[model samples]
Target: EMEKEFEQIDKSGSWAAIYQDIRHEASDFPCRVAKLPKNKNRNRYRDVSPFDHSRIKLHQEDNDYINASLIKMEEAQRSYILTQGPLPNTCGHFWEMVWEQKSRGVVMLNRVMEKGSLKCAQYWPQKEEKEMIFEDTNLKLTLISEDIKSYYTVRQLELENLTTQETREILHFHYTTWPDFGVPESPASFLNFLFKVRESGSLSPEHGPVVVHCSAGIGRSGTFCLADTCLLLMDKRKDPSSVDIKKVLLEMRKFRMGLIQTADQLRFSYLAVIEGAKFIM
Candidate 1:
């Protein structure tokens, strides 16, 4: 049952006083708050941390430090790390984030993951009381993959001995010809890539939300999410709306301050969405 998590903070109490007004400032729409379910695997992406400057904050710049910190934390938290292919600090940090923040703010080891507890080795590489944990209504994720053998094999082995037959999500892997360091050119090409993804299959097996990460999971992932969301809001048949710009840019700033820092980067996101809408049109 979906119980009200913050029942203790009832409106009659002082803690709840002016809560609505406070949330009003925080989000245009009342923010839907839900504690992430207790699960073995978490959404991929490392913590931005308590906000520090001087870090380049670019692609994998602090990956070494982040990955190392995650390794220690993972061992302490009793979680595991899984990788699709060999990646440096990239996959290490990526899995750590999944194992930590989203996976109940704790970390674990790959060895521990081998023994497996509950659905820890099943659909999600971990066990969950619910198959689809909807954390929010504003967003929906979709995963698609044609390489059933490689994709499902890794997914199943990672998440073995589960109780249910719920399907998971895995989008196609992008083989970018060049590194995408905040470049719009790459997005231009990525749009073509997304075109292929849509052609292959409109996102299916919609039970488990999609997990789209390209190394960092920020740049490419953010662009991919934004473009799709914007395309939906501003229907392909109609002209783009001003609210679309606000929504996309707002997501960048709110999720990570100084996101899309450069003009070129923002332009790249704009182009990616426009090209995508045109393709659909």
Candidate 2:
């Protein structure tokens, strides 16, 4: 029935209305944390910042400011640390959040550089580079390995606290083929790549919330959380039809402003849910 609902909307072309409604609802959540004089440089985009109420705070710091947020869903019992691609200055801050949260995976939806613009900082070591160090945090990261696939690649990285020499393993899941500011060509490939992340046990409760980001952390990041959380709630309810995609997405937007950035992304979220439901249904 969830699929049928989206099908009816698709047939009637009602996504425009839904898009505007979502924007009007939680699109104005207060975002005063990153607008301060000292914190302005931490933001990747002047227009995009996480709502202070739900923004993630750094640990053991005198000045704690990171443009990241926690998107929590009670029914799905899942949360994601959706944040902007780290600025060159904030890359150390980015790693601090990852380490402080005891995160097991970081999901990258956009490449470092796209269309002559740098979408995100090269936050981690690449194929050739063996290790990268962050001076401010005194943390060193070493690239352990990478598994290449058709549309994505997975890398294993070990994070060492240079001061204490304590290390933790982090998984980097990069969806390479996803366009910078667009939905995937289809939900089929996106869902396939999502399952690869799932099968890694990185999403398990044993690990911290996965850090997911693109450019602004709202558009495609919202799309990923929408589809993934919707399917999860469906599996939990034991009834696919009971899941309401629009209601859930609106609530998700409350935690972070602008959950789904466009009507097309909203429509694609429905399609991804409908397409993946077959696997769970």
Candidate 3:
């Protein structure tokens, strides 16, 4: 069934069509708020806007806005705060959101520097001996440990409030291989990275939603969520054929616009979902 759906999506080009259709639908939604006097400079990409319905509104006393969305999958009992990679200016609010939401981890699907361009900011402390202090938010971020892998890096971060001295531990999982607008070299490496995140127990509902971000927070970000959600459904059902990857992806898009950016991304999602189910079954 999965293979047949893939073949159909391939032959009909509906995935690409849907990708365009979603983008078109998104254009109709108002991003004028993202372009407001204060918020305009905070956005990384003019095209990427948080859906007003589910956007994460900051609780700061003044200027409560950020380009982030909360995606909740009730049936799967999971939630994710998906947002763009932190811009140099919004890094303070990025850490503030994590601290306020009590998020246990941050899943970064893109590198800080990719393809000779700045994809994401170094929001966390770069070295174990150094600590990053955000004066605007009065927050201190320290690097606890960083484990470098062949294809990914896992860093443990400690965030503290300078005023109140409140602290929280946040995990940073960075998959370094996914190219811009492209999938990873193989699903094996991606799946291995996914499981490493799962083992941390950060995705569980018992904790606050794990924050997931890539460059735009929708392309590779959506792929990660869709693949994980499908695999979890397969594991819960104990039947590989019980889950519908396409349907799940569509359902997820309602929470955020333009998920699974391209035909290639949609194709990689199906491949990852099918391959990941093997471990659970």
Backbone Cα, N, C clashes tallied per candidate:
11, 0, 0
Residue-by-residue lDDT tens digits, candidate 1, 102-192? 3211111112122242212211223223332212111112222122231111221121112242222333333334333435454555665
- What C-alpha lDDT, on a 0 to 100 scale, does residue 51 get in candidate 3? 76
Best by lDDT: 2
Instruction: Give the C-alpha lDDT of model 1.
Output: 0.32
- Find the 10 residues in a row with the least total lDDT in model 3: 22-31
All-Cα superposition RMSD per candidate: 18.2, 1.5, 2.2
- Which lDDT tens digits does candidate 3 get at residues 1-281? 68688777778878777556555654334555677888887888987888777888777878878888888877787888999999999999998888888889899998888879898898888898889999998999999999999889999988998988988888999887775656776688888889999999888777888899998899889999998988877767756676887677777877777787887887898888877866555
TM-score on alpha carbons, each prediction:
0.41, 0.95, 0.92
Evaluate candidate 1 by giving its C-alpha RMSD to the native, one decimal: 18.2
Q: CA lDDT, every prediction?
A: 0.32, 0.87, 0.83
